[PDB]
Symmetry: D3
Amino acid sequence: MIEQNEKASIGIIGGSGLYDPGIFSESKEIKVYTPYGQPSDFITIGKIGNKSVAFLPRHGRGHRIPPHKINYRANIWALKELGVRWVISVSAVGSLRMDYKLGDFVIPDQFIDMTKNREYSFFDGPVVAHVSMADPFCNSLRKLAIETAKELNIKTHESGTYICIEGPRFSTRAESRTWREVYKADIIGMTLVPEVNLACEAQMCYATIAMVTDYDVFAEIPVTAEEVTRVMAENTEKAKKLLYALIQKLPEKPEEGSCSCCNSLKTALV
Amino acid sequence: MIEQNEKASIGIIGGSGLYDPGIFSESKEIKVYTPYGQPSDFITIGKIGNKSVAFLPRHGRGHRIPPHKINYRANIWALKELGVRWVISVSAVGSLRMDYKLGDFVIPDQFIDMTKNREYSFFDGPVVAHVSMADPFCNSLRKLAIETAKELNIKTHESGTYICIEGPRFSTRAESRTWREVYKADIIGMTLVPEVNLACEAQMCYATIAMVTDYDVFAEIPVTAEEVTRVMAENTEKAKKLLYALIQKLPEKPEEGSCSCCNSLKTALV
Amino acid sequence: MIEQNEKASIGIIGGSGLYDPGIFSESKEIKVYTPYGQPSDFITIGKIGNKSVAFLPRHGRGHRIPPHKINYRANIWALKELGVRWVISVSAVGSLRMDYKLGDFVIPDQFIDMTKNREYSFFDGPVVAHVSMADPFCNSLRKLAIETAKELNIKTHESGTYICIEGPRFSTRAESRTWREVYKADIIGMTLVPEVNLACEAQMCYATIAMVTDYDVFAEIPVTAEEVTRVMAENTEKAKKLLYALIQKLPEKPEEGSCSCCNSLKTALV
Amino acid sequence: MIEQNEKASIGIIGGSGLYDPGIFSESKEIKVYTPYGQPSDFITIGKIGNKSVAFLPRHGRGHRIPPHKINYRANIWALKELGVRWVISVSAVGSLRMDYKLGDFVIPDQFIDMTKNREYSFFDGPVVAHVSMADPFCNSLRKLAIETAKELNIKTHESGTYICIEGPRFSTRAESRTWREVYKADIIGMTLVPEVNLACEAQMCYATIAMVTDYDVFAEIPVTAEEVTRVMAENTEKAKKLLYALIQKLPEKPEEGSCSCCNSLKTALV
Amino acid sequence: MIEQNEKASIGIIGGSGLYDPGIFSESKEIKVYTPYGQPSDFITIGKIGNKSVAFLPRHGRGHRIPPHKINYRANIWALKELGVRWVISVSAVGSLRMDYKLGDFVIPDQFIDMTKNREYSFFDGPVVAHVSMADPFCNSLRKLAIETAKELNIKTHESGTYICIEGPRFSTRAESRTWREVYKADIIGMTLVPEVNLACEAQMCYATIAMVTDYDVFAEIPVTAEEVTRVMAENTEKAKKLLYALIQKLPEKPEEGSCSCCNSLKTALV
Amino acid sequence: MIEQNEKASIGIIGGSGLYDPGIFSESKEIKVYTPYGQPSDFITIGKIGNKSVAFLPRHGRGHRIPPHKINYRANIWALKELGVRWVISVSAVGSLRMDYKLGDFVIPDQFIDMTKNREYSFFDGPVVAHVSMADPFCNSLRKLAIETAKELNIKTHESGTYICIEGPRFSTRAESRTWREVYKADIIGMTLVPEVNLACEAQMCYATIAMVTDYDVFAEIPVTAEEVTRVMAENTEKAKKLLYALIQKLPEKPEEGSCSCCNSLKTALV
Ligand SMILES: CSC[C@H]1O[C@@H](n2cnc3c(N)ncnc32)[C@H](O)[C@@H]1O
Ligand SMILES: CSC[C@H]1O[C@@H](n2cnc3c(N)ncnc32)[C@H](O)[C@@H]1O
Ligand SMILES: CSC[C@H]1O[C@@H](n2cnc3c(N)ncnc32)[C@H](O)[C@@H]1O
Ligand SMILES: CSC[C@H]1O[C@@H](n2cnc3c(N)ncnc32)[C@H](O)[C@@H]1O
Ligand SMILES: CSC[C@H]1O[C@@H](n2cnc3c(N)ncnc32)[C@H](O)[C@@H]1O
Ligand SMILES: CSC[C@H]1O[C@@H](n2cnc3c(N)ncnc32)[C@H](O)[C@@H]1O
């Protein structure tokens, strides 16, 4: 209902401990209209290299919004209104495997959705769409993230299955045994779904850079929120370097053959 | 979330007894995406004179949707996505005044909102808008409707205050005495609000052609749904003639000086 | 979804201070299925004279449900499932006029609906119904109530306009001046609407026996909940006598010519 | 709240690609009252052989309703009000196993519910019911469907576990590996639950005829909505033949000994 | 669910154009738990004179929240958790009378509620409360506001009826004529209700300092949001002086004899 | 919003077949305020030994509330308002293993949450909390329950994984095979989650005493509601003895060292 005059081709969605992405030189905060109401915060917009970039902290100012209350539709709609083509999510995750250690990055390639009662789609009728997500992340962006990590010499696992739980409580031991044994999951978080679904429906090229902030239930002392925040804080500098480099590496527009969600809505529409 | 290829500059919203507007030569039915879900029906689009026109029956096929359940936001959003600039509503009303006759048309110039449980706006935050509705209908379209009625020699009252009630029950006698003797309202219906509000927010020029289908509680036998249906049926041919002529008469774009809602969002935005 | 084996032709809905109607000799409590979930309480069913009667306290056990949270649809649906044809409401009201004194009964003949955001109908589509309620109470039942009061020599006003407000707060002085001066209201309460609407839609013969429990804002000390409960308690015996007598007076089925809502759905259905 | 004059003993619920069942000789479309609002479309009612049959396309006209927005309660309630005793569902599914072929029918005998945000029951209180679903489909109807397929020489698998997912997105590879390798499910879709639950609660004998329209993520090219549509279209004639024959074959009333849900509410009611 | 260590005896709720109250010397922003979710913003807490004061902008940062979406329950709950006893609202209003001029303050003593569909109470059951609102504002605080304005020689009307509308649209001419000529309202706004009700239920001493920012529909050019903003900006300094002075004048606790909501819940409980 | 004068240190939440706990000598029923509306019933409070104990039947009077509609937040809030530190749940469960026999008690130590669409937390923002649930039950209370069962010579399994399903339908055979063989669950029920989460967030010491009432799908005749009721009736006396003994054994306050939720909110807060 509003003409959005601001434009950005790249969107960053920041997770726990990343309210300030530390990537902008000059920037401003803007309110963006959505038919779903409030995005998590005003969007920060500014130039990085030759790129106009939009940033949004998914938990909002002061980490005031828990995963189950995030307005995922408003956040993705807002980025779409700005013309965003690439979406880089930075997230905090638990590790369910010994070799994915604290402070390691992970560029997941799969997910398993264990959320409950979230709003999963932009398409509620009369235009019905069923997006394919066999390979749910954008291949081209994943590959560029991996290349960036390699170039920077930042320890990064190049695949992984993210299990997304509802929260806000952390998992029981019986649940975590299931995640690791039943679903073959590698990392765990609360915010990936429906963010990734909605980005795909919006024909964006979305990928997650996850950082391991805890060992879930598997260390001598189980995960706590305090641990997650502490570990993310210890590693923000690395995250910012990776982010700054990746943003400048991105081509103008995602390749069709390397982005399954780009322009693929046609075969998803009934 | 999808590109709307179809375009129409004029939208008709049909009320009771007007499922088939009887104005189209060639037409087709389309599904239009909205972030509010289902419009009342598929939109009918087709060419009349040099105009592309979209039609929507607000109660849907078979009059299946009562006023309190109409998805007003989806209906107006759908018309907006088609590029509609002019919205002509045709509506059945009761007369609260006994100097009017059944079958008279009324082009109201004011309203009083007594609705109770509706969604009134497209603007729920963070972009806050407060649209001026002192003169709630589009003056240029009202004037053109009045000229058309005069040209056709169709009996039409050129002003009036529409009181919009919640329904679906009709008013009590005590309520109607209030509407007429105290509020000084002229006509009564259930569907004007929030349709008119939303059209204004969408920067569309909106006007109502109301036809008097009953005398509310004031005749010997009080209004019934059966009477409304019957009287509307007796006068549909007249309504179609008025509609057909008006559509032909409209200029391509409403003037900013004769449309208070056209391009006026600027001063409504906080 | 459940076959209701219990049957009653008369339903009593008790208001403030009438959790125990004091009319039954032998009775039992039953759970009644509704597609709207929970009625206010289990229904009490038992014989009075030759009549099977169902009783429901609208505020539930311990007056635990305020007017804005009453499941009006469930309550009326439950009575319909039992085969109820006559519904007698007993209510506590404020008086807006000096001559309607504490402890006086009133058999209102009109109402004005000032409620907000309640669920007003059983008909949400695809079967659309607009019930006439020009004279919103059942004439035959009102007349029988009036006759009963006359026979018992119980002081009772034989007409009156009930203004129904949302609550739970009581009215401001400016509001009450409006009710008495703008809407020409005589008594005031919070529970009549949508109970009366829904009873009409269910083709029941509904009437209210109101008792004046306070003078709203117009006495030296404005109405309080404590006053309402105290005054109702002082007059329960009278209310019970009136109720017991009226119940036995009722014909088997309401007369068609004396019940506007009985079998009148036909002309209300679009 | 209104008396349903129309009656049918058999109900068909059509899925993707089956808006027109192509089984009726003479038929009409009716609006059916429900306390849950709108069924997916008007019901089509007509006579086939000696049977009165009701048909409902679960996605509505133009496939306008996605699985997560279908009003399952209204659809089943509507069929119940028509007196339906047998419900035949025809549904498009993916195969999770590579020994099946596209176009095969499957008559599943089990399901696993992975849906997320639906309304699962007609019983929200105060009448609490917990229906047994150990064998969730009606055995007598499954057996008759299997016999019909054998008689017609239509390739049909006579058992299988249907995993129902939330959608509208299709599964990730990690999810599908779980569904097949761990859960041991055979077919996958989005619409079975809560349709089957609700039919059981309504004491109707329900069975699914599923047709394999894709191999989910397991073929060289993963499932798309386009493929589902295309493959269903290739096999509609076969589906119609099966449906027409089965309908003719049904006895007037399912047996209590071969229908676990028929007249079994007794032991489910607390 | 958490212990609130921060304390304040006075709460300020700021309206349009008052995001920064300009009254604090040193202060900090805090997040306050409520069972209703998010207050409009973080609460600013700091010392003024010998008083600990809490401030909340009801529209939030950047005026992002419109009146119909304000979480009134969370705002008032948050203040209650801090121990607030006095609540001073500062609000922009339209004047319905040409002698209440732009920039004049008004200390209303009455209100009329024309809102629709908001959440009006903290008491939804099983503890039912009906607060008396005959004189809806705290007399002691009104009197102190009036004294302060007199002492500062700031032009202030010492009574008035505030009519609260739903918005976000402004009133039609017919509505405005009704508010003035029929309801006898003096000023108009969108935010007073349910804020004032909830403060009363919370046993706070609440009063409004209103500033006239427009003449609604009654000037040559009807009210716009731009005008409201502009006029409030022209008078903020004056409002801040009034506010700063009043805050220091307040006694430690409101006297029960001059605060009808203070410790009066007892007689409101059924 | 009201001061709760009543106090209890121990809360009992009774499940199926335990409306009357049979532990009180003298007691009364009280209404307890919550910002979430109605607890399942009035709370019974009374003294046992030197302990003030509060009792709540989670299904309410007459087992009127099914698991999916229980107001878990109101129930736990109400207990918190009373000062409850220990919460003993008594629940009917199915056994997924043929060595956990009918009438056996189980003191589970783990759970798996398969519920859908319930409200899982008291913390919706702006105070975000992620409670640790690795060992979801209070160890100190579990140990005391186990000791009590040993002392009374009541057959009790001293560990086990409870899988919580949504209901109200019972599981299919395919689901049940999955719960046992895949998730490694031992017992199954519908009410544990979110009750246990919310108790942890409220810093209570919560444990479940489960009684095996059926073998789910694994006996010759699958579970029915009638069977659950019957078997629980056969063992109530035993459950009451266990309960009465345990209540008296409890120390005044749970030791922080043996209660992970006690005073642990600090590290859960972001
Ligand atoms: C600040 S702590 C809460 C955040 O931690 C992330 N997270 C980190 N570790 C885990 C874990 N082991 N399980 C679930 N979510 C986690 C979640 O996505 C959530 O937003
Ligand atoms: C077909 S009957 C119901 C319709 O009648 C219109 N209507 C006609 N007369 C009246 C009246 N007197 N009061 C309210 N609505 C009316 C309403 O807008 C509604 O959609
Ligand atoms: C027990 S106090 C609350 C009840 O009093 C009734 N009532 C009595 N007097 C009044 C009044 N003056 N205004 C509004 N409701 C009233 C209402 O319907 C409400 O359920
Ligand atoms: C027309 S494409 C969408 C439909 O396909 C059905 N369907 C077909 N194949 C699959 C699959 N592999 N996974 C989930 N749903 C499917 C679903 O029930 C949905 O209504
Ligand atoms: C910034 S413009 C919108 C604000 O103006 C206030 N307001 C000012 N003038 C008026 C008016 N004439 N009618 C209604 N609200 C008004 C309302 O409370 C709203 O929050
Ligand atoms: C009175 S029957 C319904 C109750 O049985 C409990 N229950 C008992 N056995 C089972 C089972 N096998 N599966 C699920 N819930 C069960 C549930 O928690 C529910 O409240």
